[PDB]
Design a protein around this ligand. Structure first.
Ligand SMILES: CC1(C)C=Cc2c(ccc3c2OC[C@@H](c2ccc(O)cc2O)C3)O1
Ligand SMILES: [Cl-]
Ligand SMILES: [Cl-]
Ligand SMILES: [Cl-]
Ligand SMILES: [Cl-]
Ligand SMILES: [Cl-]
Ligand SMILES: [Cl-]
Ligand SMILES: [Cl-]
Ligand SMILES: [Cl-]
Ligand SMILES: [Cl-]
Ligand SMILES: [Cl-]
Ligand SMILES: [Cl-]
Ligand SMILES: [Cl-]
Ligand code: NA
Lengths: 114, 114, 114
């Protein structure tokens, strides 16, 4: 799986250990080994949410499977909770797009997962 | 909806108010209230279009609904016009990918829209 | 087509010719003229892959057609080869998401390709 967060919060507000915390919590949440989890945090972005540039985040979670109605509600609580606690971003200023990828459409190490 | 523009134009060339204009014009175009529109502008990128590093932009518009053949033509005329007039990017150096998101796959405010 | 690479490798380690090399190699691989290939390289990113911060890349390739099981397996070899040789990234620290775009969902030059 791959989790990306884009935010206007400054880099200095991203706590040391945040990427590891995302890696471990997503491993627990998705049930996938942490070795398959990639995380990407992009601070200091020029963004607006609802026309306001108060702290916000635009995120995506891509996974081969483990995406679905109930699971995505659970991921959203987890991820909004982390963004609120660690980056001080209000959950109503977070969007997370979820993507269930077909294995044939995910390349890794000179092949795909199909 | 979420609109992202990545461009090699420098940050100082992005006019004051551009994120507000995008918010307002996309609210009008999509018919969604501006409170639901998020915008993300990423200048100073290392990009090429057709092998040329002249000004260009790579964009995406994600929305729950309001995506389709005729609508996307209209969005493209609007957005290429704005990138040309505001950022001085030729419309034939712009790509915009459009994504119709299922509500179950969009997280917000500790939940999803499903 | 559009190819995006996000990486934690520093900007100074990205060769000046890399976007042009990607453009030409992707034109040959996809069979599309280079004028329609766009490339975007984002260095210096805060990322982890499998919980560690050694060089890695998260990439995407979007194309109207020329996407599929066998083609994607081939693209992964090309793109891992380029990222390994030019950016010194191990191929098992590369993910590439592939997207077969509908022409109606790709805007360009004030319209879409539909
Ligand atoms: C960090 C990374 C990239 C995560 C993917 C990965 C790996 C090392 C070994 C394997 C990995 O994912 C694929 C796994 C595998 C491959 C093909 C398949 O059909 C099923 C799998 O579970 C083996 O390191
Ligand atoms: Cl996965
Ligand atoms: Cl592991
Ligand atoms: Cl589910
Ligand atoms: Cl897919
Ligand atoms: Cl929406
Ligand atoms: Cl339509
Ligand atoms: Cl969807
Ligand atoms: Cl294309
Ligand atoms: Cl494209
Ligand atoms: Cl280049
Ligand atoms: Cl194929
Ligand atoms: Cl599509
Ligand atoms: Na996408």
């Amino acid at each position: 799986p791959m989790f990306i967060v884009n935010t206007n919060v400054p880099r200095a507000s991203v706590p040391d250990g945040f990427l590891s915390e995302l890696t471990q919590q997503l491993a627990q949440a998705t049930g996938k080994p942490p070795q398959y989890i990639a995380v990407h945090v992009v601070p200091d972005q020029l963004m607006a949410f609802g026309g306001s540039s108060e702290p916000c985040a635009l995120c995506s979670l891509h996974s081969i499977g483990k995406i679905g109605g109930a699971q995505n509600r659970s991921y959203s609580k987890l991820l909004c909770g982390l963004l609120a606690e660690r980056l001080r971003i209000s959950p109503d200023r977070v969007y997370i797009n979820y993507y269930d990828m077909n294995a044939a459409n995910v390349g890794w190490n000179n092949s795909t997962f199909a």
